[PDB]
Amino acid sequence: AVITGACDKDVQCGSGTCCAASAWSRNIRFCIPLGNSGEDCHPASHKVPYDGKRLSSLCPCKSGLTCSKSGEKFKCS
């Protein structure tokens, strides 16, 4: 079988990993790690588990961190 996603809802994984698409390939949709301190985050992306559906190639800020504009875009701090 071809692997193109482990889950869809972060609820299936655990706090720290999201079921989004990997930044390198939109084929990866497994429990991929969230952004850490100083990491780029999408303002449109809600806290994990994400309250909906979004085909974003970037996991939001890890539990405990806040996503805010830290330069050109939003970053976790």
| Full residue range of the structural domain in which residue 4 is found | 1-77
CATH, residue 69? 2.10.80.10
- Rounded Cα gap, residues 18 and 6, in angstroms: 10
Per-residue tokens: 23: 């930044």
Method: NMR
Side-by-side strand order, sheet with 40-41: 40-41, 74-76, 67-69
Residue among 49, 54, 58, 45 nearest 12 (CA) = 49
In total, how many domains does the chain have?
1
